[PDB]
Design a protein around this ligand. Structure first.
Ligand code: NAP
Ligand code: FLR
Length: 303
């Protein structure tokens, strides 16, 4: 199923994560995106950053072309990279993502991160970036617009902007049982903004940004006990947890069997005791923990 966004469009509550590191050949994104759609994923998350928008759009068009789905059955997200915060760079970056993907519109365009970079940090008034996003929604380039990696104060800056035309429909953030963001989630719910979770399965643990010492989420003994209790898997427990808290959850897999397994999140429910045991895992652990983010003036985790 789908959640209704605050602009009246619908987002499917489970989404396919498309990112793979650059060691993975570009052609893989094509193959696995088609498999994700075949498995029942209708929400596909990409970005200018990911260098895979041609393949992901090609996957989508191919599944349209063979009659599996119509365009209006797919919810496609791209994101504005942080070298393109200056308001006059916003629509051309979106236009560029649309031409890579060969689509007429994205369902969702996000400010990828509040941490502006030189078009080396930049200083940009994100409210002007937001005004340029709104113009992209008015032109029909994006059906919905939203942000990513914003903390509460950063989100308030936008909600509080004079002359605001469109609220962000979502804030896409790192969110999983080690870092469950419950206070940010309550704030988003009170403003009718959807929290979308990435690294919901504990991230790809990429050496550039993630400490290899950090606990592996899917090896977590409480998730493992819960998987055994429900005869599911630690992944499926982690996804199901997000759905039950009203969070839209992404899931990356480039593996045929795991892609097919992940759509089982719809087949069972956790109980209130299960959810409390999962809530007890919260330990302020964002897997992305690198000097290259944390030294930035608008790093969101400084609070
Ligand atoms: N907005 C942002 O700044 C931001 C940041 C990070 C990610 N994202 C988006 O969120 C998406 C998902 O997050 P993520 O890439 O960090 O990965 P994730 O969904 O946390 O996945 C972690 C690993 O879980 C494995 N996995 C998937 N299903 C599994 C299963 N059923 N059992 C065991 N392992 C399973 C995958 O390995 P295999 O491929 O081997 O199955 C995957 O590499 C990204 O692809 C991207 O679209 C956005
Ligand atoms: C690599 C890229 C992504 O979308 O995967 C990414 C991941 C994490 C972040 C991020 C954003 C804020 C704090 C720490 C990390 C990002 F800005 C971009």
């Amino acid at each position: 199923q789908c959640v209704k966004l605050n602009d009246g469009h619908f987002m499917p509550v489970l989404g396919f994560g498309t990112y793979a590191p650059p060691e993975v050949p570009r052609s893989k994104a094509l193959e696995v995106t088609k498999l994700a759609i075949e498995a029942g994923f209708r929400h596909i998350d990409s970005a200018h950053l990911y260098n895979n928008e041609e393949q992901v759009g090609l996957a989508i068009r191919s599944k349209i072309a063979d009659g599996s789905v119509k365009r209006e059955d797919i919810f496609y997200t791209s994101k504005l990279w942080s070298t393109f915060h200056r308001p006059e760079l916003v629509r051309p970056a979106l236009e560029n993502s649309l031409k890579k993907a060969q689509l007429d519109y994205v369902d969702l365009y996000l400010i990828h991160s509040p941490m502006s970079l030189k078009p080396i940090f930049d200083i940009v008034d994100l409210c002007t970036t937001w005004e340029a996003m709104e113009k992209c929604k008015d032109a029909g380039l994006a059906k919905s617009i939203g942000v990513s990696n914003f903390n509460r104060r950063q989100l308030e800056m936008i909600l509080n902007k004079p002359g605001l035309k469109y609220k962000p429909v979502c804030n896409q953030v790192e969110c999983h049982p080690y870092f469950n963001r419950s206070k940010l989630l309550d704030f988003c719910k009170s403003k009718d903004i959807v929290l979308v979770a990435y690294s919901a399965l504990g991230s790809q643990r990429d050496k550039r940004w993630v400490d290899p010492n950090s606990p592996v989420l899917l090896e977590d003994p409480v998730l493992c006990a819960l998987a055994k209790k429900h005869k599911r898997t630690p992944a499926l427990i982690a996804l199901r947890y997000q759905l039950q808290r009203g969070v839209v959850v992404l899931a990356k897999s480039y593996n045929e069997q795991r892609i097919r397994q992940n759509v089982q999140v719809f087949e069972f429910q956790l109980t209130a005791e299960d959810m409390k045991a999962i809530d007890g895992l919260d330990r302020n652990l964002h897997y992305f923990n690198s000097d290259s983010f944390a030294s930035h003036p608008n790093y969101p985790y400084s609070d």
